[PDB]
């Protein structure tokens, strides 16, 4: 009665994730000057290029060359030996900016999902949490000089064996771990593989989940000197399952980064997480999936759905009534409840938007019923 489940994450220097962080660096820059900025900033990265495209309504005057280049510096691409350099890369701006509310209409149509699971303290699947932490660990050891051969582009994948308990899920052991990470010309493969096991995996994954049968795919393709935008074109919103629940729960298709609160792709997904987490932390269920949907120009959600996997004594209809009584999921109210005009978005753009840093949507609401 066991099953395998797999989730992945990627590091800050992965080209898709570079674009997410830049898109959010742009959004933060606008919001610092104009809290009411409307932003739909897409970023594209390739060998020697960052291109920005999209539509903005804002009173801000933003230095795109300075914002983009500082974001690439933070990530760690600061020399041509690493395949990309903030000092000398091309930055092209194709943004179209115009000068310029409880019941504001949704900025678009779409559907969004929230999810929570009691298998971890942060109410997230173990598979995705470990995957994220492996990439975070790599960045730490790169930045503090423990493994100076490390470069910013990385990918991890974690397969966990579960058992199920009346619709809830219980992690037993890690079955397989993959790690691929960009590196300098000097470091040999055996040194890298040894370090990824001892200094990364064993520092991150609780020892009770590792055993002698755990499968390790470390630098499985061999060498990986060419990385970042040089090796692989990147686009904003191409890591949406990394950003959310790692294959668990569900997704409505919408990207997060480069978008203001009126874009319910972001705001309503954050709120649905908040609802899902509030239901689990309030003891109403162990595992829960929440769907919402919107029409452009209309404030109230078109639909709200709760799925509890059989982990509640209450019916799904009862949980829906509790949600309706405790949450107002119009964009103009979510913005107040979750403080979404604050320029906090660049910090969400790597290592997942959920299960860390106690952002407002991770602080559960106390429920009246």
- Binding residues vs K ion (CB under 5 A): 40, 232-233
In whole angstroms, give the CA distance from residue 173 to residue 159: 9
Residue 329 CB neighbour total at 10 angstroms: 24
Beta-bridge partner residues of 57: 38, 98
Tell me whether residue 261 or residue 327 sits nearer to K ion (CB atom).
Answer: 261
Interacting residues toward Mg ion by CB under 5 A: 16, 238
- In 120-263, which ranges are continuous DSSP H helix? 126-143, 189-195, 202-204, 228-231
The candidate with the shortest Cα–Cα distance to 167, out of 362, 15, 2, 311, is 311
State the Rg of the chain over Cα.
21
49 binds its own copies (CB under 8 A): yes
In whole angstroms, give the CA distance from residue 113 to residue 129: 18
**Cα→Cα distances 192→129, 213, 232, Å:** 23, 21, 22
Is 269 an active-site residue?
no
318 binds its own copies (CB under 8 A): no
188 binds its own copies (CB under 8 A): no
Q: Angle 331-338/264-281 helices, nearest 10 degrees? A: 60
Is 238 an active-site residue?
yes
- Binds its own copies by CB under 8 A, chosen from 235, 264, 275, 340: 235
The interface mask with its own copies, positions 322-361, x = CB under 8 A, is ----------------------------------------
Q: CB under 8 A: which stretch of 3-11, 77-85, 116-124, 327-335 binds its own copies?
A: 3-11
Is 198 an active-site residue?
no
Catalytic site residue from 16, 24, 260, 362: 16
Q: Whole-number minimum distance, CB 238 to Mg ion, in Å?
A: 5
At 41, phi and psi to the nearest 5? -100, 115
Q: Whole-number minimum distance, CB 207 to its own copies, in Å?
A: 22
Is 17 an active-site residue?
yes
98 binds its own copies (CB under 8 A): no
197 binds its own copies (CB under 8 A): no
Q: Which residues are catalytic?
A: 14, 16-17, 42, 55, 155, 224, 232-233, 238-239, 259, 263, 265
């Amino acid at each position: 009665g066991t099953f395998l489940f797999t989730s992945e994450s990627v590091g800050e220097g992965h080209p898709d994730k570079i674009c997410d962080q830049i898109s959010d660096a742009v959004l933060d820059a606008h919001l610092q000057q104009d809290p009411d900025a409307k932003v739909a900033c897409e970023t594209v990265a390739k060998t020697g290029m960052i291109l920005l495209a999209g539509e903005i309504t804002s009173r801000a005057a933003v230095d795109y060359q300075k914002v983009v280049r500082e974001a690439v510096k933070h990530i760690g691409y600061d020399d041509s030996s690493k395949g990309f350099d903030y000092k000398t890369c091309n930055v092209l701006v194709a943004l179209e900016q115009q000068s310029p509310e409880e019941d504001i209409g949704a900025g678009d149509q779409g559907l969004m999902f929230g999810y929570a699971t009691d298998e971890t303290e942060e109410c997230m699947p173990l598979t995705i949490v470990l995957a994220h932490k492996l990439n975070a660990k790599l960045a730490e050891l790169r930045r503090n000089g423990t493994l100076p051969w490390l470069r910013p582009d990385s990918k991890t994948q974690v397969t966990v064996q579960y058992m199920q308990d009346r619709g809830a899920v219980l992690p037993i052991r890690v079955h397989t771990i993959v790690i691929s990470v960009q590196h300098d010309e000097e470091v040999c493969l055996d040194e890298m593989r040894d370090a990824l096991k001892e200094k990364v995996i064993k520092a991150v994954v609780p020892a009770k989940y590792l055993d002698e049968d755990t499968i390790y795919h470390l630098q499985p393709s061999g060498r990986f000197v060419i990385g970042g935008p040089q090796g692989d074109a990147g686009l904003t919103g191409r890591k949406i399952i990394v950003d959310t629940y790692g294959g668990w729960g569900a997704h409505g298709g919408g990207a997060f980064s480069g978008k203001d609160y009126t874009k319910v792709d972001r705001s309503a997904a954050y709120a649905a997480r908040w609802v899902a987490k509030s239901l689990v932390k309030g003891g109403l269920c162990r595992r829960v999936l929440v769907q919402v949907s919107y029409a452009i120009g209309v404030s109230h959600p078109l639909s709200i759905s709760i799925f509890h996997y059989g982990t509640s004594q209450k019916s799904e209809r009862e949980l829906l009534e509790i949600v309706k009584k405790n949450f107002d999921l119009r964009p103009g109210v979510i913005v107040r409840d979750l403080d979404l005009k604050k320029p906090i978005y660049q910090r969400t753009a790597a290592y997942g938007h959920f299960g860390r840093d106690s952002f407002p949507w991770e602080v559960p609401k106390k429920l009246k019923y």
